């Protein structure tokens with residue numbers, strides 16, 4: 439999971 | 443396009 | 447010896463979401479209490495262990511309407527349906543418990559994982 | 570304020586390809602000369618300007634069989650259909666002209682681009  |  | 451187009455899968459998903467927004471070729475309505483959500487069975491199966499089981503069933507595969515358990519929260523379902531079609535999860539303090547419970551029911555292991563990690567960090 | 574699961578779009582596409590291999594929920598046969606290819610209309614539209622135009626047409630949207638132009642090469646179509654479902658393009662010296670002509674007909678601009686670049690490098 440990432441900060442887009 | 444890339445070499446996978 | 448294939449070459450690969452990096453953005454292809456993201457571009458496919460973006461167009462599947464455009465089809466959903468325009469209600470094109472949607473073949474099922476998911477009923478969550480008083481709310482209805484139109485979707486593509488193929489996308490639901492590709493994202494969820496529950497829908498994969500439902501739509502490989504020789505009788506349920508032909509249903510145009512699927513009713514979810516009355517304990518399922520419509521907003522939680524809406525957030526997960528948006529995730530299925532975009533890879534983006536609108537996870538907030540006010541919705542995390544409903545999102546996690548819905549992801550457990552829908553069998554969306556990666557969403558469950560992250561909900562667990564975000565809850566563990568707040569305790 | 571969304572979070573994003575990097576591998577989600579690739580995972581969706583992998584499961585759409587598994588559905589295609591098992592012939593689950595395929596809703597169209599594409600006929601290319603003597604050969605037939607089963608696919609999902611939603612994936613074809615998401616990848617191709619030609620299928621996007623065909624399946625948004627109020628009459629053609631309901632067809633179970635689509636016949637392509639007799640000049641279209643079945644192998645070229647097969648390579649492009651595999652690309653649609655995997656992001657991988659099996660581009661070879663022996664098939665590049667057929668792949669490029671098929672991609673121009675199917676309106677798959679990124680495939681056309683690369684075929685053009687690979688041909689320019691060999692001349």
Ligand SMILES: N#Cc1cnn2c(Nc3ccc4c(c3)CC(=O)N4)cc(Cl)nc12
Nearest residue numbers: 491492493494495498554555584587588
């Ligand atoms: N054919 C086919 C096909 C279509 N969909 N699909 C799967 N869908 C799925 C099954 C379980 C889970 C998820 C997705 C996300 C998750 O957390 N669990 C799996 C397979 Cl092995 N095959 C297929």
Ligand SMILES: N#Cc1cnn2c(Nc3ccc4c(c3)CC(=O)N4)cc(Cl)nc12
Nearest residue numbers: 461464465614615616617618621677678
């Ligand atoms: N709704 C919808 C929807 C479904 N599919 N789709 C598009 N599919 C497409 C149209 C043109 C081209 C390609 C894909 C690849 C290419 O080279 N050209 C576009 C839009 Cl703007 N919208 C949609």
Ligand SMILES: [Cl-]
Nearest residue numbers: 554555556557
């Ligand atoms: Cl997931």
Ligand SMILES: [Cl-]
Nearest residue numbers: 677678679680
């Ligand atoms: Cl393309």
